[PDB]
Amino acid sequence: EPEPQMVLSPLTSAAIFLVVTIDSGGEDTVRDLLSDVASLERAVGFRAQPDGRLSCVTGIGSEAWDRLFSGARPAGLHPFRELDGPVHRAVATPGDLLFHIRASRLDLCFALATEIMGRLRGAVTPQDEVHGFKYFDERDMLGFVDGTENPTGAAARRAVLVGAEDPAFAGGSYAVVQKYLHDIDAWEGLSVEAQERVIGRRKMTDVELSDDVKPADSHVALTSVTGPDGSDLEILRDNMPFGSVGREEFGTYFIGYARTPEVTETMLERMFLGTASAPHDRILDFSTAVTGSLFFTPAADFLEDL
Amino acid sequence: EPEPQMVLSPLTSAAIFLVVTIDSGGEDTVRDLLSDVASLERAVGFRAQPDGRLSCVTGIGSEAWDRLFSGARPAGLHPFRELDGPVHRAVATPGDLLFHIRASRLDLCFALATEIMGRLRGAVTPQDEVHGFKYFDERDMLGFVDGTENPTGAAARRAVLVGAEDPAFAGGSYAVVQKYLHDIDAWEGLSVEAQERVIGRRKMTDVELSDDVKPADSHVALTSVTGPDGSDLEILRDNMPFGSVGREEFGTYFIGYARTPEVTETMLERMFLGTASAPHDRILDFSTAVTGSLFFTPAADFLEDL
Amino acid sequence: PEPQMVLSPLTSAAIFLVVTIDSGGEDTVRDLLSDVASLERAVGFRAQPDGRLSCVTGIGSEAWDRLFSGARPAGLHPFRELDGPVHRAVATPGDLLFHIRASRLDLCFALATEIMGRLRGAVTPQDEVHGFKYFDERDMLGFVDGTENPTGAAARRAVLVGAEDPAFAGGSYAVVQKYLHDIDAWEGLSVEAQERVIGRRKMTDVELSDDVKPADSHVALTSVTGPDGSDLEILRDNMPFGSVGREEFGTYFIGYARTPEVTETMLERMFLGTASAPHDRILDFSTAVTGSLFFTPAADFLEDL
Amino acid sequence: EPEPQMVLSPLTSAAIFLVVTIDSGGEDTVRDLLSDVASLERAVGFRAQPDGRLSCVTGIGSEAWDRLFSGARPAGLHPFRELDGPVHRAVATPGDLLFHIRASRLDLCFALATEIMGRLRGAVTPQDEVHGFKYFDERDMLGFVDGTENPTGAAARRAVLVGAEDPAFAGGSYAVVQKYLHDIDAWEGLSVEAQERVIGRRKMTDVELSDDVKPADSHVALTSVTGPDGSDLEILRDNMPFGSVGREEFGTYFIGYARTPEVTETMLERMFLGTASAPHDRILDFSTAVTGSLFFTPAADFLEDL
Amino acid sequence: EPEPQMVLSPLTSAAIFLVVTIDSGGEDTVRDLLSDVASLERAVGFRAQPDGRLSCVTGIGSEAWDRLFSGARPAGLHPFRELDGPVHRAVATPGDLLFHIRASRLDLCFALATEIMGRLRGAVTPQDEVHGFKYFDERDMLGFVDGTENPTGAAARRAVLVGAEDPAFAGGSYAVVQKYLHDIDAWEGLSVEAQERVIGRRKMTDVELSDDVKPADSHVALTSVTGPDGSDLEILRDNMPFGSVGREEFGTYFIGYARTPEVTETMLERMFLGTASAPHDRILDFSTAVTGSLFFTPAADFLEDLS
Amino acid sequence: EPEPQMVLSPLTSAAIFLVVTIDSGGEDTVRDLLSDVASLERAVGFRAQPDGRLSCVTGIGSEAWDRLFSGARPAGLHPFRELDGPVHRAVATPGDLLFHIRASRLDLCFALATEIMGRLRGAVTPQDEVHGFKYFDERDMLGFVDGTENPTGAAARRAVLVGAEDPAFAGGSYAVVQKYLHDIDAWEGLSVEAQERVIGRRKMTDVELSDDVKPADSHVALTSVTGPDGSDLEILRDNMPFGSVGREEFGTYFIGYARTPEVTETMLERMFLGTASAPHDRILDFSTAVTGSLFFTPAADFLEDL
Numbered sequence A, B, D, F: 001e002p003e004p005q006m007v008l009s010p011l012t013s014a015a016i017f018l019v020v021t022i023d024s025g026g027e028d029t030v031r032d033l034l035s036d037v038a039s040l041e042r043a044v045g046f047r048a049q050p051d052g053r054l055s056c057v058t059g060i061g062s063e064a065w066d067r068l069f070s071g072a073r074p075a076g077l078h079p080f081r082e083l084d085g086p087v088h089r090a091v092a093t094p095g096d097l098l099f100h101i102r103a104s105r106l107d108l109c110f111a112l113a114t115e116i117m118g119r120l121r122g123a124v125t126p127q128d129e130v131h132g133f134k135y136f137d138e139r140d141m142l143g144f145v146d147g148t149e150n151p152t153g154a155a156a157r158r159a160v161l162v163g164a165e166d167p168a169f170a171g172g173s174y175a176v177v178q179k180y181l182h183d184i185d186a187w188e189g190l191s192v193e194a195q196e197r198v199i200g201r202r203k204m205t206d207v208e209l210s211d212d213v214k215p216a217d218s219h220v221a222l223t224s225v226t227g228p229d230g231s232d233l234e235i236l237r238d239n240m241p242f243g244s245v246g247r248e249e250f251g252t253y254f255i256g257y258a259r260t261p262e263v264t265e266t267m268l269e270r271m272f273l274g275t276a277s278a279p280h281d282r283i284l285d286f287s288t289a290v291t292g293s294l295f296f297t298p299a300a301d302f303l304e305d306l
Numbered sequence C: 001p002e003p004q005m006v007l008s009p010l011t012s013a014a015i016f017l018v019v020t021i022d023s024g025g026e027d028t029v030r031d032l033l034s035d036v037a038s039l040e041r042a043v044g045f046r047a048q049p050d051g052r053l054s055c056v057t058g059i060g061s062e063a064w065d066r067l068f069s070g071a072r073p074a075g076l077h078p079f080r081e082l083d084g085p086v087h088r089a090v091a092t093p094g095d096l097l098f099h100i101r102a103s104r105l106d107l108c109f110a111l112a113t114e115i116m117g118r119l120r121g122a123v124t125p126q127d128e129v130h131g132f133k134y135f136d137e138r139d140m141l142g143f144v145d146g147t148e149n150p151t152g153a154a155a156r157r158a159v160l161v162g163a164e165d166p167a168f169a170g171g172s173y174a175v176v177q178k179y180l181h182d183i184d185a186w187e188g189l190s191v192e193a194q195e196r197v198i199g200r201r202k203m204t205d206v207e208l209s210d211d212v213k214p215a216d217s218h219v220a221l222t223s224v225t226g227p228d229g230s231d232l233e234i235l236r237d238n239m240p241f242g243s244v245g246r247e248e249f250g251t252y253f254i255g256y257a258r259t260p261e262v263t264e265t266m267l268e269r270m271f272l273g274t275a276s277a278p279h280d281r282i283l284d285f286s287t288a289v290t291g292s293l294f295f296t297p298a299a300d301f302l303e304d305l
Numbered sequence E: 001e002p003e004p005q006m007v008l009s010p011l012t013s014a015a016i017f018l019v020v021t022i023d024s025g026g027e028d029t030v031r032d033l034l035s036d037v038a039s040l041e042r043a044v045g046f047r048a049q050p051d052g053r054l055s056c057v058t059g060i061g062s063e064a065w066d067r068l069f070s071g072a073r074p075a076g077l078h079p080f081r082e083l084d085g086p087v088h089r090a091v092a093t094p095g096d097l098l099f100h101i102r103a104s105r106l107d108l109c110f111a112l113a114t115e116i117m118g119r120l121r122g123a124v125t126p127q128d129e130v131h132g133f134k135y136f137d138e139r140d141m142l143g144f145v146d147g148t149e150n151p152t153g154a155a156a157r158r159a160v161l162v163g164a165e166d167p168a169f170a171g172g173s174y175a176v177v178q179k180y181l182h183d184i185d186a187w188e189g190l191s192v193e194a195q196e197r198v199i200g201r202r203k204m205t206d207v208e209l210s211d212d213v214k215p216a217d218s219h220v221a222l223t224s225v226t227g228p229d230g231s232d233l234e235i236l237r238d239n240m241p242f243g244s245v246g247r248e249e250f251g252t253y254f255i256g257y258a259r260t261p262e263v264t265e266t267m268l269e270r271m272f273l274g275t276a277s278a279p280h281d282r283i284l285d286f287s288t289a290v291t292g293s294l295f296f297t298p299a300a301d302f303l304e305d306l307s
């Protein structure tokens, strides 16, 4: 009965990521938009039926939630936990509202973004805006295929959607966003085979490295987490490349959905704080997190009945 | 589990609407076709996998039903109710069988209709035939995006399909057809802003007017209905533009699917008869209905079991 | 001299529009004729990538005299009616031809709306046809249609007016005929019998060998070798159209050529026959309902008006 | 609950069928591959995330099953039953593993096949390899639309997927393969009308012949089978054209899926051994089977737990 | 027979515009890149051979030409002329090199820009970078179809390519670039009718307004220019929308190609300074130019035969 | 202006290469086909307008020319010259007629090939048949983008088409074909960087190595040839990948067009025999030529006038 947002939807060739903070006194303007967001999506999206694939996923931060609503909160909703590791650091930056906008064409994303921000003008301060674009055969700026091991079907729904563990918010999800910038100069100084050891997959063919060759400090190794019951802990990632050539800015916009933030945070902890066998994730030697925010994306019904 | 026809299927770029009456002694020939209609659909349709999206929905009129079938009747099935309003009239016209044919290309539509009419030749009289075509970004002849607020998924299934309320005809639906002709001269006499107030939405962006600005005699206002439940009463529209430039025919072929004809009929009444708030729908000052028929579209199984 | 899109390939959608000019409508028509190209751009640029919208404007012989003063295209005359022993190629009124093509019907309809909107009260519509592509470039008889159309340089020489009439160089002559087919009769024949009528294999579209091809087949009759060794050629943009209810299953014939003599020779062979053929066998399943001849001038001619 | 392989997925424009036998001492390598087969599918397939439609269905033969797994056997799993008819013979040929690889592009098929064979090198002996291609409007080498009467939706699910009757192997399916070479010289000696009477459908339009003109030895007649219930027994066919012009090879690669092999075998017996009214299937007068193998295609999660 | 750059190439769904100045002592690194620019294009472009449509047009500014080259100069090459009108100004901003990169996908544009800039690092300073995107049915941020009256075929060739009037630079063109930011708030205050009067064409249908009702201060009227002959002066425009929603930036990146800058400059003059009939172009009441540069785009041969 | 065959047309995603020898006494049948080849091309091709992009280039060998035609010979037509290098060897294999068939779909290629061979059956013997397919982003089986430096426009015309040097055959061209099989095992034993030194270009980005890094025995170095005036001698290559996973066949089908064979032969000599600076082409250490034929491809009007 709880109808989820488009959190299970596949990766698209264009995306707009939009993070704002709510100005004091903006609450009411924000509530009005939240109840219209699905309506605005249809209004723009319908024009490009059937190949438009326009979707918007709306997320609300921990502090924003308390300003907007009264009563019970999602069980795991808290501000992004800053991770201060020996070498690398995962910062928390401000963000009350997330708009994850996806389509097969940028114009659709931009048109929807304009409609949303038009209604929010004077109530919100923009914190981050990223226009994501598909890079060749689903590659990131590091030149590796990105998103291969994303869950599908029942597994995707099992890993992503809040269920009976928090029944009042069933159909919701948790999104962690991090804007990463890459040091391409240092990355390109590595041989392809060395880069492969950093990731844990073959560069060209996207084939996973054998369990023999794959280093303990490789990205694939550290982000592979098993639960106490032996099951794999999974997240759904909709990462998109972005960048500016003149500024020498080459980035991955990280976004990860999971039914509990504990799954995503365990992965982050392994990456930044390391394990007993790895000091940290080698990918972080060529990647710097510049933002960090956590949002709860409620069921579609929740926004409607508001 | 009853198998419905393609009544929940989305809008396509081409369409053929075919309305016929059954001649004297034509019952047997019609019964034979009805049992073969799905196979005829596959015979043509499979030639254009996967992008063809050929479908045919077959409807049977109230009078026609009793000539064709012994036993139970669908509970809602009756002849279309003519509405003689103070200024605007919803006419009723003859129609025994409906063929609503859709595909991404007209050739597929035309080929199926050829096979259908081939099998019915000498048993039926053609009443109406319309070839519909997608007009730009899902627009109608009035220049507005048309079909934005159609229900989807669970909401659509609930609004369109017969359920427990008539168990013998579960998976069926009721179709109302009306061929509307538009007075484009008069319409293009109005400013865009004046047009927007007629419809209740913005012309280019298809964004709904604020409730503050939205007139009560706007099309959107009049066709927005709530039951004693307090929930929205919804229909599924597969409207298509048509016309001939030389004959000054600029048309909307209206087709609405609902689980009970009462829903569609209520909307019709509000449009032609008006409420306490409005004398009639302003759209009708630019739209003249020239046909009007009601059909029950059975479950796919029902057709095969003949 | 810039020609019209007369060499453009076949599209998946077309609108054919034939009108007569009402007396006193001369001036309205002239102003439209000067605006037709910018009207095309107005609609077509909206689908700039893959819309492929074009409009070829044709003017009739009688209309030419009423509209313009001075030089006449040499080969411009009314459509010559052919009263054959069995079949007739009728002549019907038509002053203006609008041959509108695009990859989508919406683009065609929009342009036609704009044209007729300007011409309203100055013209009377005679014919309007909405053409659609039928499977793998097939006509209503179920055969691939347009295979032997000239291409490239050969197309240019066959279609475009050259030095023979230098005042109208880059123009062309368009012959239109709406045909209705007897599908009940046609579907009676076996495939092999149908192939003998056309002169090609039905499914594969392979031309029958000269050893097996009947003298009264469409291909044999429409293959014309002129005074020299050169074959005479026309460019056809035939489109299927119809209505299942009215039992209309049609082919809208349009053929472009440098001189109408080429088209007329083929037409005579079809209706009046030759030495070893009474008439084109296709005509036993095909009836012409319209017949008109237009000159389609260079783009610059229409512009400088 | 059980997650099947892409056994229900539709026809694509490119396919690779790979049939191998397992060498002595190659069981270890085969098991290790079978556990990785799904990840290899993703490694190649994610590269063309939209449009790609890369899938691989892995099947295991009877003899191979006993060599490979210790435990319960799928109830219907047995070697292909050779049929020695009075005129036509259905040969049984060796085959331990089936790889049914499909995509919208051959490169994806070839790439995945390379990765699979690269892992299996020196553990398997290749028996058959066929590169299938779509031919015009879903036609076979006989010039007839092929696949028309395939079940879809729920009907497909019930006909193809193993259910409660064999609960330990729920979500599995049975695949029967046969490579056919056609005698095109003989075939193109018949008139179209005569060809139609062999198949049971019109050639150009793919419209089924009426039952009162359809011969009893036509392909459609003999492959139409009803059970004790009175309902139709159905299989899902993904057969693909293939061939080589220089060696006069014009072929149909037959692949049929069913929830029980008894269905496919019944239709094979009728074709080869005939019925009361029909000596054999007239299609075999122009078709020769050179291979014949039967495989069980387990649920996806069965392969993964190795 | 000189080979032009893809200057006559049509509009695409994605573009990158890159404007840089050459630093002191950067001349040799630049000259070296200019010789490999075509080969860099093929290196990236061949990967999407079918429907990629990757192209790069390289332009060189007036001051930069004297620094790079020793021989003759194109006859019409000069710095962008600033226009100080009573109300509106057309600014001249620094820019030595122009890279007009187009494809059907942004990734192709970004891959080529990465290669170009990678070779030019330390030698050049970025001035402007815009990533352009198609907006619906070829619309601009004002919501009007943009490019309709672009010349095609022979007429385009005659309008854009340098010919016999300057035979040593035949197959070249002149490109004028201006980045415009729009005041959407103000624009959306106008009715559709009122907006139509600013532009000179119907909004949705893109049909040109009738001559009797088309205002003298409309965009279409002011940029309609007949020469001394009586024939129309024409330019080829590859305008692309761009913007940032959060920063409230809604822009049109203007680029016009012409065989001589006099054509484009005349149009500019009519827009900014006005005529006897019109004070200025009304579009400028909602559009602010923030960049302005002029470049000569040489024939491909010129760039290759630098070696 | 003599009309050329489609020797200038671009690379397609599908290709069939057909090489046959003319049987004793099959000359008359060959001449009749040659006059109908363009007609056959249109017969199949027109069915798939406008995306089909079907074309067929017909070539005639040296020895075959003398059997077929009386009168003048193309100036540069001769048998393929075997190259017996110190290490590698370019074999000469029999070939009278080349059919180079390309389209966006294999079906069109296969259909045309069928028609051609159907007419030549009993008059010719097949020597070679390859079905080519596009591999990812125009890559070859070595994993490098293949065809990057092909000339285009006027440059291609001057490089490929016979001109005034041989007036009677203007519009014609010369095709050299070589079927190469690759040793993939060995090639994948090299690092990416080593592979780059073999080819002379970066692997993923396809950017050419600078002159101070590019080895003299690299493929790009050895196939770069300057002529008398100092301008590069160029060929047009339409290389297509092919292969069979079962038989470990991973191949490049090499075809090169040039206005004179001298150009293609110089490159071949440099590759196989070597220079003072280069023992041989390093690509040959991973590539074996198994066929080798030279053909003249006449202007189109030459074929029809027969």
Ligand code: HEM
Pocket: C139, C141, C143, C144, C145, C146, C147, C148, C149, C177, C179, C198, C200, C218, C219, C222, C223, C234, C251, C253, C255, C263, C266, C267, C282, C286
């Ligand atoms: C009744 C409507 C007509 C139909 C259904 C029809 C159909 C066909 C077909 C199926 C072909 C063979 C495929 C092709 O090359 O296009 C063909 C060829 C041709 N038709 Fe028609 N046609 C019609 C009317 C006409 C008329 C009126 C003319 C002449 C004025 C004409 C001239 C030709 C020519 C010149 C060819 C090519 C013959 C060759 O050189 O091989 N057709 N037509």
Ligand code: HEM
Pocket: D140, D142, D144, D145, D146, D147, D148, D149, D150, D178, D180, D199, D201, D219, D220, D223, D224, D235, D252, D254, D256, D264, D267, D268, D283, D287
């Ligand atoms: C020689 C290779 C074969 C060819 C060329 C062939 C071709 C066809 C064609 C053209 C049809 C009609 C279109 C359709 O419904 O798919 C058809 C139907 C069918 N074929 Fe085959 N077939 C072959 C082998 C087989 C075999 C071996 C089986 C069974 C094991 C089989 C089972 C069926 C079934 C069940 C149908 C559907 C019949 C109906 O219910 O109407 N086919 N086949």
Ligand code: HEM
Pocket: E140, E142, E144, E145, E146, E147, E148, E149, E150, E178, E180, E199, E201, E219, E220, E223, E224, E235, E252, E254, E256, E264, E267, E268, E283, E287
């Ligand atoms: C402020 C940014 C601008 C916008 C949004 C804009 C938009 C438009 C629009 C909507 C049209 C009508 C449709 C068309 O034919 O393309 C147009 C026409 C035109 N614009 Fe602009 N324009 C801008 C700036 C300029 C500038 C700076 C120039 C000259 C340097 C220019 C030259 C033209 C020309 C020559 C035409 C065609 C006029 C005709 O002959 O019909 N535009 N522009």
Ligand code: HEM
Pocket: F140, F142, F144, F145, F146, F147, F148, F149, F150, F178, F180, F199, F201, F219, F220, F223, F224, F235, F252, F254, F256, F264, F267, F268, F283, F287
């Ligand atoms: C063994 C099979 C071959 C493979 C896999 C192969 C592959 C390649 C590759 C990857 C390139 C660089 C990208 C490009 O510009 O296309 C290339 C370039 C080239 N190849 Fe080959 N090649 C083969 C055989 C040949 C042969 C036999 C010739 C001539 C007889 C040849 C002539 C050329 C030429 C002229 C170039 C362009 C060099 C330049 O100017 O940069 N190739 N080839």
